[PDB]
Structures are given as C-alpha cells and as structure tokens.
Amino acid sequence: ADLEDNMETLNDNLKVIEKADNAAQVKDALTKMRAAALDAQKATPPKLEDKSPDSPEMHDFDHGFDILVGQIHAALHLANEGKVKEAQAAAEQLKTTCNACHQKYR
Amino acid sequence: ADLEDNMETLNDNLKVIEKADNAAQVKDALTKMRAAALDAQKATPPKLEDKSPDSPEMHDFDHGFDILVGQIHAALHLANEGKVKEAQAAAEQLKTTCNACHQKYR
Amino acid sequence: ADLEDNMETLNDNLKVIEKADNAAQVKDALTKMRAAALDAQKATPPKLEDKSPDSPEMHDFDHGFDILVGQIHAALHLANEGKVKEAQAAAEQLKTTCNACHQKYR
Amino acid sequence: ADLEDNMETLNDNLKVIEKADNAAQVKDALTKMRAAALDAQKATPPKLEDKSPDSPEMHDFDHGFDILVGQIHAALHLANEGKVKEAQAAAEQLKTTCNACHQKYR
Numbered sequence A, B, C, D: 001a002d003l004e005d006n007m008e009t010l011n012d013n014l015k016v017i018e019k020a021d022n023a024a025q026v027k028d029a030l031t032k033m034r035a036a037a038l039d040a041q042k043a044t045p046p047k048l049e050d051k052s053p054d055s056p057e058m059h060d061f062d063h064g065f066d067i068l069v070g071q072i073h074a075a076l077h078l079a080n081e082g083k084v085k086e087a088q089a090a091a092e093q094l095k096t097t098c099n100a101c102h103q104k105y106r
C-alpha cells in the first residue's frame, strides 16, 4: 500500500491498542503496525519527491521509520510478556515519533 | 507477496548489481532488494509456520532480515558516494547472510 | 567503567531527567546515559560468565542493550528539539527495558 | 583509552583477522573490534570538536559507528558458525566503512 493507507492502518491500530483488553489484541495490533511500517518504509513523501533518494532529508525520513519500527519492536516484547499497561504506554510514547516526522516532512 | 517471490526478487537483483555498468543501476537494484527484504521480513516461512510469532526462531528470523536490510543500507551509502565497485563488492559480501538464514530456515 | 558502575550512572541520570526543568539538562543526562550504555555493552554479566560469548544468552543480552541505547537515541532527538516533557516521558518509558534485562540476567 | 587507541585496536585486529588460521582466532579479533568500536563511538572527533553535540555532523558520525558495529555483528555470526573465510571477507569488506568515515571526519 501507499504512505496514505499505511499511515491509516498505523493510526487505526494505535486506537486498537488504546482500547485493547488483552495481550493478544495489543500484540495483534503491534504486529499489524509493524507490517504497515515496513511496507511504508519504501515510499517517498510528497514533500521530498523532488529530493535525492539519498539526500540529507531522505536519510532522515528513512531514519524516522527505523525509530518507529524499533519502538514497535520493544512494544511487542512487552505485549508478549503479558504487560498490557506497559505496552499501551509504549504505544502512547512512540506517538512522539509520529509527530516529529510529520512536523518535518508532512 | 509470497515469500518465494521476494526471494526471487532478491536473487535476480544480485545479478543486476554484479553486471551493472554504473551507479544508477546498482542503486536501482539495491533499492528493489531493500523492498523485497522488507516484504520478506513480514512473512512466516514454511519451516516456522508451526512456531508462535513470539519464539526464538521467529525472533531470529526477523533478526536475519535486519542484518540483510542493514547491509543493503551500507551498500547504498557506497553507491551514493560514487563507489560503484565497493557497492558491488558489498552485494557480493551479503550473500553470506542469504546462506546463513537458508541453512537454518529453508 | 565496569558493567556495575555504568549501571549506576544510568540510574543516576534517569533521576536527573526526572527532576530536569529545561532541555539543556535532559540532553546532558541522556548524553551521559548513552556513553554509560555504549560502555557497558562490551561487558559480560556475572549470570552469564560461564557461557559461550556467542551463546543464545549473550546474544539476547546484547539485544537488550541495543534496545536501551535505541531508546536513549530517540529520547535524545526529542531533547534536541527542545521537547523536555516528551524526552522525560521517553526516559520513564525505557524503564521497562531496564526491568526486562534485570529480571532475566541480573 | 581514547579515540586514537580504539582506532589502533581496530586496525590491529583487522590484520589479525587477515592472517588468522581458524575460527577462534577470528572471533577473538572481532570481539575486540566490537569493544573498540563501541568505545570510540562515544568520542567527539577533533574535526567535530567545535560543532554542537547534537549537530548533523555528530549524528552522521554516530551513524557510521552503528554501521561498523553492525558489520562486526554480522561477521561474528559468520565466525561463530565456523565460516572462517567468509568472516575474513566480512572484515575486509567493512574496511569501506573505515574509509567513508575517515574521508569525512579524520
């Protein structure tokens, strides 16, 4: 899918995690986010489409998804350990990653 | 896409890179590899379909792709610096990652 | 420094971030957290002293540190952008990583 | 030790790895390179001494070590599996990383 739909799936599952009851739903949510993140990591934001694929700006953009993906990785460990509250706290915290990139390249 | 189709993409582009005349071709092939690895990374291999998403094997499987994507990342740096030869040698080098994963999960 | 002392440095600055009032203070503490983290990453914990330095356990142990440093790195971004509270929430959040390794390897 | 001592250690073990006759010798050499790389990663290079601690230059400097450490990580896996020739090829290939950072900051 394209950034749009991946960002959508990404955003949706954040709400799923926030309203999740058990670990399986959060785990399931994070997994879907992981998939959306990895798929979107190969796209080029409309504001950098005129920038070199490997310019200072694009390397930062790519770096951004790496951060998010790492945050989703750590979150999964928590959810896997049955730590639902900690996992939801990590989902909220990684929200800064979402915002930071948007401020820069959205 | 099916795990094998991504593997086919990975395999062919290794050839494209080896036969490349210029930086443009190595980068193009490297970027397609990045995309294939990332899609591959979301898949559940036949030999591990019985395991849980949270298991030493699946965590190791995921790690293998982080290794590959990171190597593709380094290769891309050399290519965007004009070092066509070094980028080609890097693609040759990461073949070891391909073999290492296969010996365990293929 | 040794593993044990770097851990102290880590815990002390975590409290500095908690009591911090400006971005300057948080950046400095995080900076120190990264150095003590990178420094401690080379060590072998007493719980795994007698075990292949290439064992599954040492690999997992090292992974835990990557997660920690990875989190400190993102927290540093926030701090560098002048987002005190956002960075403070990141320091809080990564406590979960400290916890996870301790229960398993300390 | 300082940046300079860590760089010497990196260079020595590169030579050890080249002449190594077995897997144990290579693992030992890579392990030392790992510690030296991580030790150096915390240092501010003379050429970046007047830059702000969180400037693009320092972020790029840090990224370079991440790459080097990742390459050592992959090489260790090779060595750990007894693939001596492959690990040595890995060590020689990462020399491109040594080069790239030197070109920019040495």
Ligand code: HEM
Pocket: A003, A004, A005, A007, A008, A010, A011, A012, A014, A045, A046, A061, A062, A064, A065, A068, A094, A095, A097, A098, A099, A101, A102, A105, A106
């Ligand atoms: C969990 C975190 C994230 C969430 C929940 C999220 C959510 C969204 C949403 C809902 C949109 C609007 C899509 C639309 O216009 O239909 C969007 C757009 C966008 N996001 Fe994110 N995002 C996240 C992280 C990121 C990150 C880390 C980056 C950059 C590295 C990023 C870059 C963008 C860009 C460039 C757009 C505009 C895409 C376009 O206009 O086609 N996002 N995001």
Ligand code: HEM
Pocket: B003, B004, B005, B007, B008, B010, B011, B014, B045, B046, B061, B062, B063, B064, B065, B068, B094, B095, B097, B098, B099, B101, B102, B105, B106
């Ligand atoms: C760039 C390096 C790589 C190349 C060139 C490559 C190439 C291939 C090829 C040609 C196949 C057979 C596809 C088929 O039967 O249709 C294959 C299978 C496979 N590869 Fe890779 N691969 C690479 C990296 C990896 C990595 C890093 C992993 C694991 C972390 C991996 C896991 C697998 C698995 C599990 C299969 C078996 C799939 C099945 O039997 O359905 N490969 N790969």
Ligand code: HEM
Pocket: C003, C004, C007, C008, C010, C011, C014, C045, C046, C061, C062, C064, C065, C068, C094, C095, C097, C098, C099, C101, C102, C105, C106
């Ligand atoms: C920011 C997070 C962390 C903090 C604040 C922290 C803090 C500490 C502190 C203060 C101690 C001393 C315990 C005592 O008084 O007996 C300690 C010991 C230890 N920590 Fe951590 N730690 C953190 C993360 C980690 C991680 C990520 C790992 C593993 C990857 C880890 C592994 C250990 C081990 C193995 C010891 C025992 C060392 C010894 O007694 O020889 N810690 N940690």
Ligand code: HEM
Pocket: D003, D004, D005, D007, D008, D010, D011, D014, D045, D046, D061, D062, D063, D064, D065, D068, D094, D095, D097, D098, D099, D101, D102, D105, D106
């Ligand atoms: C295996 C790879 C590497 C080897 C073999 C290596 C080797 C060396 C050597 C022999 C020196 C000269 C030491 C001296 O003058 O006392 C040096 C200097 C330096 N290296 Fe590396 N290096 C490697 C990787 C890197 C990387 C990845 C970076 C940056 C990300 C880097 C940054 C520097 C800097 C900044 C200096 C200047 C030190 C000074 O003059 O104070 N090196 N390196």
Ligand SMILES: [Ca+2]
Pocket: B002, B003, B004
């Ligand atoms: Ca199949």
Ligand SMILES: [Ca+2]
Pocket: B012
């Ligand atoms: Ca073909």
Ligand SMILES: [Ca+2]
Pocket: B028
């Ligand atoms: Ca093309």
Ligand SMILES: [Ca+2]
Pocket: C004, C005, C008
């Ligand atoms: Ca002490």
Ligand SMILES: [Ca+2]
Pocket: D004
């Ligand atoms: Ca010198």
Ligand SMILES: [Zn+2]
Pocket: A073, A077, B059, C063
């Ligand atoms: Zn993990």
Ligand SMILES: [Zn+2]
Pocket: A059, B073, B077, D063
């Ligand atoms: Zn890079």
Ligand SMILES: [Zn+2]
Pocket: A063, C073, C077, D059
């Ligand atoms: Zn960064």
Ligand SMILES: [Zn+2]
Pocket: B063, C059, D073, D077
């Ligand atoms: Zn590994």
